[PDB]
Amino acid sequence: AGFAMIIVASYTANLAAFLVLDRPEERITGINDPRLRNPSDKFIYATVKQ
Amino acid sequence: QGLTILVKKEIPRSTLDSFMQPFQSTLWLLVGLSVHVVAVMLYLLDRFSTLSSAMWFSWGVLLNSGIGEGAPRSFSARILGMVWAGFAMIIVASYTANLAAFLVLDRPEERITGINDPRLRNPSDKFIYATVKQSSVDIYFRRQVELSTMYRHMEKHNYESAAEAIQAVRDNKLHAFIWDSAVLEFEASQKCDLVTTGELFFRSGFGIGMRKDSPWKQQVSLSILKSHENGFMEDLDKTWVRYQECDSRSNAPATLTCENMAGVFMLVAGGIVAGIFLIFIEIAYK
Amino acid sequence: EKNEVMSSQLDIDNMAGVFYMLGAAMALSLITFISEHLFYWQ
Amino acid sequence: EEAPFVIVESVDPLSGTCMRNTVPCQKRIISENDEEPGYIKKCCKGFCIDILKKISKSVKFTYDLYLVTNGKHGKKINGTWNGMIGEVVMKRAYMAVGSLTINEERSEVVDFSVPFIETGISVMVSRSNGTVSPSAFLEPFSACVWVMMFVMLLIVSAVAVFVFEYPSFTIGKAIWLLWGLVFNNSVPVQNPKGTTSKIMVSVWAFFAVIFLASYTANLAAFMIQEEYVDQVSGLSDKKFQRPNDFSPPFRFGTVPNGSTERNIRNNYAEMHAYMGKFNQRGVDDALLSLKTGKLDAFIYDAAVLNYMAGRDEGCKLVTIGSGKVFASTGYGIAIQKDSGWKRQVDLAILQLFGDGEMEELEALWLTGICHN
Amino acid sequence: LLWGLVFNNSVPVQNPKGTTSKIMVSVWAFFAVIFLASYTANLAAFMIQ
Numbered sequence: 001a002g003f004a005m006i007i008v009a010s011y012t013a014n015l016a017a018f019l020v021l022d023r024p025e026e027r028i029t030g031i032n033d034p035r036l037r038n039p040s041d042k043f044i045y046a047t048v049k050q
Numbered sequence: 051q052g053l054t055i056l057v058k059k060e061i062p063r064s065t066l067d068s069f070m071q072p073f074q075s076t077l078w079l080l081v082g083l084s085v086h087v088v089a090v091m092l093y094l095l096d097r098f099s100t101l102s103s104a105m106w107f108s109w110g111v112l113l114n115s116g117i118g119e120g121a122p123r124s125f126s127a128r129i130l131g132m133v134w135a136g137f138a139m140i141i142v143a144s145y146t147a148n149l150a151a152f153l154v155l156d157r158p159e160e161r162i163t164g165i166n167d168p169r170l171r172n173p174s175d176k177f178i179y180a181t182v183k184q185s186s187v188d189i190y191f192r193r194q195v196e197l198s199t200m201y202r203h204m205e206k207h208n209y210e211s212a213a214e215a216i217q218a219v220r221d222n223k224l225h226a227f228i229w230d231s232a233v234l235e236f237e238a239s240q241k242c243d244l245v246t247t248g249e250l251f252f253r254s255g256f257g258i259g260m261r262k263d264s265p266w267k268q269q270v271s272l273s274i275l276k277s278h279e280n281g282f283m284e285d286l287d288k289t290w291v292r293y294q295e296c297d298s299r300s301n302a303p304a305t306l307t308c309e310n311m312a313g314v315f316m317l318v319a320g321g322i323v324a325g326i327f328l329i330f331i332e333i334a335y336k
Numbered sequence: 337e338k339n340e341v342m343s344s345q346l347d348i349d350n351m352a353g354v355f356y357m358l359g360a361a362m363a364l365s366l367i368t369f370i371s372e373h374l375f376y377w378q
Numbered sequence: 379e380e381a382p383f384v385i386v387e388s389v390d391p392l393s394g395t396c397m398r399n400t401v402p403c404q405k406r407i408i409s410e411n412d413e414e415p416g417y418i419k420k421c422c423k424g425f426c427i428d429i430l431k432k433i434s435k436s437v438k439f440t441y442d443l444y445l446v447t448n449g450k451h452g453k454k455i456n457g458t459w460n461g462m463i464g465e466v467v468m469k470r471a472y473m474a475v476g477s478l479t480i481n482e483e484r485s486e487v488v489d490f491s492v493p494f495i496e497t498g499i500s501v502m503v504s505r506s507n508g509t510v511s512p513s514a515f516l517e518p519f520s521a522c523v524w525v526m527m528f529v530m531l532l533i534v535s536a537v538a539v540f541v542f543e544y545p546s547f548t549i550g551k552a553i554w555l556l557w558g559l560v561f562n563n564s565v566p567v568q569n570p571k572g573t574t575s576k577i578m579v580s581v582w583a584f585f586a587v588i589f590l591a592s593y594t595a596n597l598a599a600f601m602i603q604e605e606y607v608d609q610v611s612g613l614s615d616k617k618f619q620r621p622n623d624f625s626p627p628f629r630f631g632t633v634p635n636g637s638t639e640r641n642i643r644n645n646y647a648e649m650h651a652y653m654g655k656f657n658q659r660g661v662d663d664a665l666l667s668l669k670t671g672k673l674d675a676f677i678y679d680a681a682v683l684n685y686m687a688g689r690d691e692g693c694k695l696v697t698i699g700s701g702k703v704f705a706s707t708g709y710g711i712a713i714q715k716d717s718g719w720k721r722q723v724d725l726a727i728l729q730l731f732g733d734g735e736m737e738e739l740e741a742l743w744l745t746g747i748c749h750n
Numbered sequence: 751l752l753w754g755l756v757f758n759n760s761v762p763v764q765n766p767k768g769t770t771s772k773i774m775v776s777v778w779a780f781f782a783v784i785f786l787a788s789y790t791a792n793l794a795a796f797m798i799q
């Protein structure tokens with residue numbers, strides 16, 4: 001019975017972990033964010049030409 | 051080498067005030083009255099198309115026990131008991147949710163991250179730290195066009211020799227400390243009560259000097275350069291400095307302990323007292 | 337521009353919904369007992 | 379013009395030369411021609427260019443720039459000097475800047491100022507995806523609470539049977555019930571008799587419910603663990619003199635034909651041979667195929683890794699800490715032997731350190747944003 | 751019975767007649783435990799505001 005309690009509980013705890021940190025990357029925090037300071041090819045950002 | 055920081059670090063003991071912490075002192079009694087409310091409502095609901103029995107049934111399900119023999123024999127009392135049980139689920143569920151969200155969030159304050167750190171960005175008196183007197187450190191802190199604000203804050207608490215500072219911070223008198231790297235690096239890896247921020251702070255480098263134009267300089271300068279390809283200094287390192295090991299082992303959320311769960315254990319004594327009362331009172335009532 | 341905190345029971349007012357549903361169920365129980373005292377008529 | 383220290387770019391045609399705070403540099407090119415070389419190559423900026431420009435502005439002397447046409451960081455070619463330093467033994471120029479090391483064979487003829495940026499043979503590692511403990515399921519409670527639980531079990535069973543003596547519930551049935559209740563649930567069993575003694579199992583059940591709740595709550599923390607950075611000391615490590623203690627996948631990254639190689643084939647040679655199949659083409663292939671487990675540990679000169687770290691999109695590329703490096707040397711400046719500028723540039727570059735500016739410069743080029 | 755199972759537990763009944771009703775209610779209770787767990791987790795999500 002003790003082993004049963006442990007398996008169920010650990011299941012709940014692990015799911016609790018995986019849901020809490022399921023939130024997307026932070027909004028671009030300005031002109032100095034990593035994801036924008038040095039470029040990358042995942043998500044691009046530009047302006048109108050000329 | 052460069053400059054670094056030094057501050058005590060230890061396993062926290064983030065702990066609940068009491069098992070009753072995640073509720074207010076009111077709702078605790080709200081549910082306690084409402085349970086008897088809905089119990090007696092069952093008792094005056096089923097009796098028309100079993101008092102202590104319905105009392106037991108009603109007051110049990112908030113405990114997920116196995117105690118309880120009776121049940122509702124009407125229809126309406128059934129349609130009540132269903133939602134009663136649902137409420138009993140929600141209560142303890144929310145309790146678990148709240149306690150968890152509390153114990154995951156409360157990870158103790160960050161370490162002193164570096165010169166630009168907020169928690170020391172300004173000079174402050176609720177967070178006191180020192181430095182080395184008459185040394186290269188207040189020399190480099192002399193010409194501080196910007197840093198003068200903390201320059202004065204240090205020079206109002208400056209310290210003389212290392213045996214002051216290390217022994218003091220080990221005794222939790224001060225908060226932070228500064229020096230050149232090698233000294234505190236070694237002192238950390240020797241005894242494992244203190245750590246560093248690992249953040250470099252201002253480059254420099256030791257060396258050897260003689261009074262000007264003495265005829266030695268060239269010979270010693272080529273000798274030292276000879277003493278860094280054959281790795282003799284590489285050996286000197288292991289001879290004296292990179293000498294021990296204490297693992298990093300990022301600390302944990304600090305298991306609950308023998309400390310405060312005795313708030314609950316306070317319950318068994320009340321149980322015993324109430325029992326030795328209720329036995330005699332039962333003898334009387336019988 | 338952001339942080340997080342853990343409340344204490346989080347309210348009485350936030351929890352009020354549960355008592356709302358409790359009272360609603362109690363009312364439906366009462367009206368159903370009445371309707372049973374009625375429908376024994378059949 | 380090799381590294382991101384000494385960059386050159388195409389001449390700006392819209393406003394004449396470069397239009398922005400740089401110095402030109404020329405290039406006299408003749409190869410497989412009788413004729414005369416020479417033409418304005420390009421505008422010519424960079425970190426090393428920055429320190430040179432400022433230091434000249436402060437010690438009041440003027441200069442000019444043309445590049446090397448035949449050679450590199452030269453070595454002994456038939457007992458001579460070609461390339462950069464060769465351009466200084468021939469007195470065809472006065473000083474040498476740019477990414478340049480310091481050794482004996484070069485300290486023989488030219489002379490070297492006090493170095494500014496550190497350097498040395500270092501290593502490159504990568505983090506590890508999480509380290510959920512093996513003995514997790516017994517962590518979040520102290521040693522007390524369990525034996526305390528057990529003895530509370532015993533005493534409650536005792537008081538239960540003894541308030542009961544006022545089929546027949548006894549020690550066995552009672553303890554079994556109590557265990558099966560404090561753990562979530564199990565095994566429908568006989569209950570206690572007597573209305574009064576029911577209070578005890580009740581309050582016990584209260585204890586148990588709050589217990590299980592608290593326990594799952596706490597244990598819901600030991601599944602959130604921070605990124606684990608590996609640990610390793612300098613290249614005197616058990617993990618590399620005897621690399622077969624674990625699988626051969628523990629591959630080592632070192633590009634051949636250079637200072638790494640030569641400074642290696644002098645002291646151990648066994649790492650040298652063992653790294654035979656683990657050769658890698660430069661830094662591009664290295665710092666790409668390292669992220670994907672094909673390349674794991676690295677060997678190079680830190681003054682390039684400590685740069686390339688803060689450019690990769692990820693964050694799993696961090697060197698080991700300082701104070702654990704091999705070839706403690708530094709880039710510097712090279713001048714003709716025993717001239718009358720060693721002293722002055724020395725004093726002025728130490729001044730540059732003392733006043734706190736090189737931090738700003740490294741912030742402009744050398745270190746990136748991707749602090750760890 | 752089956753209502754008293756999703757929410758935690760109460761009210762002793764068995765319905766134990768022919769072991770196949772047993773193998774039926776079994777999977778139901780299984781789904782119940784996983785449901786309750788998922789709920790507790792994703793609600794502990796919101797108590798952090």
Ligand SMILES: N[C@@H](Cc1cc(-c2ccc(Cl)cc2Cl)cc(CP(=O)(O)O)c1O)C(=O)O
Pocket residue numbers: 380381382451452477478479633634635636637638639640679682
């Ligand atoms: N430092 C040497 C030449 C030299 C230069 C580099 C190097 C490569 C790319 C970049 Cl971006 C910057 C630098 Cl400094 C690397 C090595 C290493 P290896 O020996 O494997 O060739 C080397 O030797 C000298 O000046 O005598």
Ligand SMILES: *[C@@H]1O[C@H](CO)[C@@H](O)[C@H](O)[C@H]1NC(C)=O
Pocket residue numbers: 507
């Ligand atoms: C590490 O976790 C990330 C999370 O998205 C995953 O993308 C990556 O493949 C994982 N790598 C390893 C080696 O586990």
Ligand SMILES: *[C@@H]1O[C@H](CO)[C@@H](O)[C@H](O)[C@H]1NC(C)=O
Pocket residue numbers: 634635
């Ligand atoms: C590097 O050196 C090895 C042996 O010294 C040689 O086999 C190999 O061809 C060299 N590679 C280059 C690119 O010079």
